[model samples]
Target: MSISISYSATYGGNTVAQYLTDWSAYFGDVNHRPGEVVDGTNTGGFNPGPFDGTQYAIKSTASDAAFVADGNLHYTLFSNPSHTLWGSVDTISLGDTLAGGSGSNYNLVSQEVSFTNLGLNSLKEEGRAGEVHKVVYGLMSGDSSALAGEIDALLKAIDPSLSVNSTFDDLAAAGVAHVN
Candidate 1:
């Protein structure tokens, strides 16, 4: 019933929306993680891949098994103008456990997506390039479906200065396959 997201990117002249678009395109790239689909072409490229020091980790109680699933924590690709979701939403199955149980009995499923940050001025570019910006994408139940509102709320909670675009539902509905 809780989600936490921390995002701070220093790219200049780019609206928060633009930075979000870049993240969607970059993270959901075919070369990135294939589990989550964004664009079919997987060709909507970015400035250049200097992907380092950026990492995402998810810890959730699964309804599948006692062990957590480690696959992909991906952003829905293409344009997310209407309801851009800046974090992970897929249900993580707690394979070996059931509901209505205490915390110990809830079981768990876990996955992590890792991206990197450059040391001060390591990439030669300014602002976002040298900045140590990190994104922490996490989903903790809410029965998976009702989490949309919570996610949006959570994003705003951590940092009110940033813009929020609803939930994973928004991304699912607004996101499209990449085109030329």
Candidate 2:
């Protein structure tokens, strides 16, 4: 199966592990359409609200009918067709935070997905607020998994000092419930 992980948040830092863990379980259970909004709480109480503030669209490679089957969710890498870049508008609000003792600062986050001809695929978690912007992208080969090992590898690639082992059971044990 193709694996892609992208996340962005102003307040929550590096919650990609939780997000991906929950996504695997949720998609494995729920059959959703392109325009449907999957509640974040429904999958796992790991985020603020709806998983993707903007609805997710089916990549050109697969028909909408192939989204889910036999308890396995398939993801057509965003922009996989042209091996180009694909991104969404920033709609998720991360609220406001104090910055350098300079009053209240508002920031927003969004998701971005990209693929390259060199077999490099990445999911970028981006945040922006005036002059402050941050991005954490999970990188992997064209073919990969969302399991613990892949997640750890991506995390390490992004930052050598970071590592998280998030398995399906681990997410479930943390009260991140999902359908069958």
Candidate 3:
């Protein structure tokens, strides 16, 4: 099956524009070493709860940066406080969960599998959509050397051929205009 994805201005209850502008500071300890900390803001921090004991920070609404809120995850750049607002990587797995609308039921089968199986068996039961969607967002944030490196590692793990640099380039090519 061929998988296709697209971007938008809103996803769930968040707006890419609004979130990007306010994200300024990394929520984690700045002095922490690599692999020792997880930075980034999340508006849904308190709502959905963290995955794997890591709390997701909310992207600020104070900066000019923000995402476009497409179906896939989104991110935006801002000045003033100076930071990027990136949307949820976890939500990607729950595809169109919000499509149900107020009080609608969206039954989803969470893929139960191990991270070791990378072949067909693994691929079939894996949360394939989420992996692809989240990785793209990671690539978009590659401007930060550290963050970029982390994204590079992730991309390599998923697919050795995936180009972390090229993904950021794509994001730059699709640049969003700033407005006051």
Provide the TM-score for each candidate, comma-separated. Answer: 0.21, 0.25, 0.25
Please provide, for model 3 over 1-180, each residue's C-alpha lDDT reduced to its tens digit, 9 standing for 90 to 100: 111122232321233222221121321213222344345423322122322111122222233222212122222223322222333332222111112212332222221110111111112122323443233334224222332343345445544654334332232233311111
lDDT comparing candidate 3 with the true structure: 0.27
User: Candidate 3 — which residues are off by over 4 angstroms?
Assistant: 1-45, 48-57, 64-143, 168-180
All-Cα superposition RMSD per candidate: 19.0, 15.9, 14.8
What is the model-wide C-alpha lDDT for candidate 1? 0.26
Q: Model 1, 76: alpha-carbon shift in Å?
A: 21
Summing lDDT over every window of 10 consecutive residues in candidate 1, give the lowest-scoring window. 111-120
- Clash count of each predicted structure: 19, 0, 22
Candidate 2 residue spans exceeding 4 A from truth: 1-6, 10-14, 29-148, 165-180
Error of 2 at 155 (Å): 2.9
> Model 1 compared with the native: what TM-score?
0.21
